[PDB]
Amino acid sequence: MAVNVNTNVSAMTAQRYLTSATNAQQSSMERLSSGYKINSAKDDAAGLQISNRL
Amino acid sequence: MAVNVNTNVSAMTAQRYLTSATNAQQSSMERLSSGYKINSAKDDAAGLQISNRL
Amino acid sequence: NVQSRGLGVAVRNANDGISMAQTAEGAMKETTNILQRMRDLSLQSANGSNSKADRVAIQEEITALNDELNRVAETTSFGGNKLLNGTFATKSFQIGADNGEAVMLNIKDMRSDNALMGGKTYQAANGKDKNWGVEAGKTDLTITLKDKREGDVTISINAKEGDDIEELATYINGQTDMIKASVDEEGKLQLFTDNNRIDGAATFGGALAGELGIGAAQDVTVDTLDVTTVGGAQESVAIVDAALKYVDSHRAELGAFQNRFNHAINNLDN
Amino acid sequence: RVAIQEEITALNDELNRVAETTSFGGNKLLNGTFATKSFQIGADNGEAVMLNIK
Amino acid sequence: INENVNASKSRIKDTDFAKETTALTKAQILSQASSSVLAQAKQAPNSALALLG
Amino acid sequence: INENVNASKSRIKDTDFAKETTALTKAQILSQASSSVLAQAKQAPNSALALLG
Amino acid sequence: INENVNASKSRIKDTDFAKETTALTKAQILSQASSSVLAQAKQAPNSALALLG
């Protein structure tokens, strides 16, 4: 591979998977404090409607 | 043989093994971050299908 | 000297072929991710627990993801090209010092309305309620199939006596992987046929087939995938599984192409 | 196994390509058209060494 | 089943940090050694010049 | 896509320091050698004159 | 709203450290690379003089 200094593909891959982890980590730490796995509509659409009805 | 300046065969051979060394190293540093040894079909085409089914 | 310069250009063109392959594979993963998301959610909508108000919420989310597959099929460009639109025909990459030794590449269309992303379906004309069961002498169910590989396959299903309309579908699913069955709301079986391997119409015969409805062949794809009642929910997961198989098969072909070219670079360098 | 056969038939074209691509300035080293070539490595004629590539 | 299929979704898709890290480290030493070989490969033409100033 | 197109924006626009520096080095000794040829070729007219006073 | 607008008041104003530090490091190697280029570019006139003492 072209050993260069302008582009760091490996760094970009590490960054992409870093936020792939911290986004799920930030997705947690808020369901632990709230005590609900459903607190925003983006978690489970069907679950929100049935939970509100329940 | 040829103590020349226009062709550096030894440098070319070091070039090729440098390419193969950091191609596999670039393949690494992303299995660790992602946590999967299967993330593209080029790693294992057969493994991808069965892993997705599982 | 001409060969040496040609090899340098050859590894450049070959590397471009690798980059075009992995760019397609980048959106390949997202296409798989969405398809799985529909499949698990369709399982949730297949519940008899949720009401129509919950299922319409499911369809709203499903049609949201459906627009995503259509969008990603057009967004993936790689500098003005169209990798997944289907407009990308067979492009040959010149990977040698001389001419004529190119390697063809085909990236199939992956719009959600693609024929290979769905398949055929058949519906029972008359449903069977809970009290109904399979009676003696009416259990044979022979299905004639046309297959892309080892075609003209005839499989016979002998339903166990006393089986109701629901466990009958489970029995058919277990006996063969070529057919997917499920009852919707009154006992009508929804036989599914995956298009990319079971091409052609399927003929139904036997005493049990006459007891139920033979049904016609209806083409359904992911774009036409609609889940508003549990019947469409059982249909959709079968459709999604066929789509996932097609996407994975296309991913594997791209992967082997990547390996051919990775082995091409070090050969050309040698 | 269908996907595995896809990888096998893909690699199969690779041998059929490299056997026809290895040229060394327009020759055909592995295509099979390379017959027994004799290299003259002596001061006079007749002192050659034959070589065949299958 | 769910316990065991998840186990089967390991060593098929999941990576071990045991043998992967050694593969990474071996690559680091290999690339460092190859790059240092380049350093001594550059002056080979230079020594060829030195016979005639 | 952005990750992979950046990879394609390499060996297309980006230069690898390994094969490029050795090309620079080869040219440096090429310049040093070629210049010394001129210095050795200045005395050809000089020795040409020396045959007659 | 306050929680969400603070989340929105980031990646438009707040910087990250993942991609930014790599940008800093890439800049640093760039600075050392071009600075060393000056070292090899300063001797080019010197070799011009060397042909005639």
Curated annotation (Swiss-Prot), chain D:
Sections of the chain in a coiled coil: 1-21
Source species, domain of life: Bacteria
Subcellular compartments: Secreted; Bacterial flagellum
Similarity comment: Belongs to the bacterial flagellin family.
More info: V.cholerae is able to differentially regulate the flagellins within the flagellum maybe to produce flagella which are particularly suited for motility within a given environment.
Main function: Flagellin is the subunit protein which polymerizes to form the filaments of bacterial flagella. FlaC is not essential for flagellar synthesis and motility.
Complex and partners: Heteromer of multiple flagellin subunits including FlaA, FlaB, FlaC, FlaD and FlaE.
Protein name: Flagellin C
Residue range from the parent sequence: 109 to 162 of 377
